[PDB]
Design a protein around this nucleic acid. Structure first.
Length: 118
RNA sequence: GUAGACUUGAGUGCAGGAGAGGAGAGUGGAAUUCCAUGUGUAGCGGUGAAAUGCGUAGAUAUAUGGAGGAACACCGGUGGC
């Protein structure tokens, strides 16, 4: 007896960090009910950005998107990593309708100093 | 040294351009972090890994606007000043 929706063109916010990756599926502006990460699953160690583990991370919330009931995907990828690519082909092949893989990695212009030497 | 001469060195004229040359007076965007904020769940961190820790007071992440400082990637180069 809880409030539910049937959206179709969700917006798939997936952030591949350089250690992990969230895999999220979003509303029209939006907000995510069907969403996860790699690190949601207990792959904590050297297994934090294995790309087939990222494939299943880009599969689990992907199949959880049909709780809402969406099939076409409005993909948005941010950030690179060491597990990004099989996640990319994963949600390109995750029972979905890949048409628009967005690339929204934000760019400074000699901005703030990063933390130092190593 | 003394008187003398000329430009043929220097500089001053008339024409050109050039630059991150200085010093002030302002403006713009990206980006970071933070104020609320959609609405959802443990996450994120880091490495060879984690304890560090923060965080369920339920958030990061994602939707927005605001705030502020910093600095201004290709331009940019054995380039110039």
């Amino acid at each position: 007896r809880r409030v539910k929706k049937n959206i179709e063109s969700g917006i798939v916010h997936i952030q591949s960090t350089f250690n992990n990756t969230i895999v999220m599926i979003t509303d029209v502006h939006g907000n995510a009910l069907a969403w996860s990460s790699a690190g949601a699953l207990g792959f904590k160690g050297s297994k934090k950005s294995t790309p087939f583990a990222a494939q299943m991370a880009s599969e689990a919330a992907a199949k959880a998107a049909q709780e809402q009931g969406l099939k076409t995907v409005s993909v948005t990828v941010k950030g690179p990593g060491s597990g990004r690519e099989s996640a990319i082909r994963a949600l390109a092949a995750a029972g979905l309708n890949v048409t628009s893989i967005s690339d929204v990695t934000p760019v400074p212009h000699n901005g703030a100093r990063p933390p130092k030497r190593r």
